[PDB]
Ligand binder design. Structure first.
Ligand SMILES: Cc1ccc2oc(=O)ccc2c1
Ligand SMILES: Cc1ccc2oc(=O)ccc2c1
Length: 285
């Protein structure tokens, strides 16, 4: 029943196409250098993640939340690795299968319609780009234990996740702004990512360490998300008429509120986006 209440907030892939770049990447871009197009910045974000993973030819990369398959293809093409992708979306599964089958390679390419809970095959390296927000706090210990256990002695993982701060830390940066941010987060995890729950950077780090990972200083992507959300918002606005035709005025207003609102709270430093690297004890220096 509560699912039905959330099922209300389901939106066609066609709507997201009207604000996203041509790769349909629904995560923080990386504008390095600063004058990259959104689309180029999305390839630079993939490279930022993959370049941290010490990927060698013939290794297997696991992509947890593999989206439309952009990260896996880039991995196969750049690093000559086997790939396994996990997605819960039937549409993303079908697209990924086609993206991977198109690649000129002898490497193994696999996409599975399942969550990480059901995945227990040996892999060399793991990437997860803005899927972690959906796992839930109670599942973090199981997540990091699974990732540690499926990787070899030199295993590495990157997790990119939107984050909030502990209530105590939020209170420290103005009471007014603290309650305002909490209410906007509640809107995101009700109407935009139903059942979602933002971790803190500290949770991401400490759950990793409990599992046995070495965790260097997380990379903040805050200024890159501000630019991403600005372009998304401006793009949705430019396509207002088409967006309404495809869904409704309700859904257009909901997403403009989300995109403008996120840009605001990222600017006010009440939200962040953390790229966290997890190194197993035997990882290369
Ligand atoms: C279903 C669908 C159709 C076209 C697309 O174009 C892209 O480049 C990436 C994602 C995508 C997904
Ligand atoms: C589940 C989920 C995924 C992405 C998110 O991005 C945000 O900025 C805030 C909340 C959030 C929640």
């Amino acid at each position: 029943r509560f699912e039905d209440i959330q099922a209300h907030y389901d939106v066609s892939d066609d709507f997201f196409a009207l604000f996203q770049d041509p790769t349909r990447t629904y995560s923080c871009a990386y504008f390095e250098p600063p004058e990259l197009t959104l689309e180029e910045a999305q390839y630079a974000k993939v490279d930022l993640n993959l370049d941290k993973l010490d990927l060698k030819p013939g290794m297997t990369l696991l992509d947890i939340g593999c989206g439309w398959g952009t990260t896996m293809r880039r991995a196969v093409e750049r690093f000559d690795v086997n790939v396994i992708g996990l997605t819960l979306s039937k549409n993303q599964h079908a697209r990924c299968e086609q993206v991977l089958a198109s690649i000129d390679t002898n490497r193994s390419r696999q996409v599975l319609l399942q969550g990480w809970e059901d995945f227990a095959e040996p892999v060399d390296r793991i990437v997860s780009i803005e899927a972690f927000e959906h796992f839930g706090h109670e599942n973090y210990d199981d997540f990091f234990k699974r990732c540690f256990n499926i990787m070899p002695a030199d295993g590495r993982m990157t997790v990119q996740s939107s984050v909030s701060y502990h209530p105590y830390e939020m209170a420290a940066r103005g009471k007014k702004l603290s309650f305002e941010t909490a209410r906007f987060i509640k809107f995101i995890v009700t109407e935009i990512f139903p059942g979602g729950r933002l971790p803190s950077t500290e949770m991401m780090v400490e759950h990793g360490e409990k599992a046995g990972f070495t965790v260097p200083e997380p990379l903040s992507l805050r200024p890159h998300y501000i630019k991403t959300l600005r372009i998304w918002g401006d793009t949705l606005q430019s396509n207002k008429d088409k967006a309404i035709e495809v869904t409704s005025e309700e859904v257009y207003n909901r997403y403009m509120k989300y995109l403008r609102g996120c840009e605001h709270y990222f600017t006010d430093e009440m939200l962040d986006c953390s790229l966290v690297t997890y190194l197993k004890p035997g990882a290369a220096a």
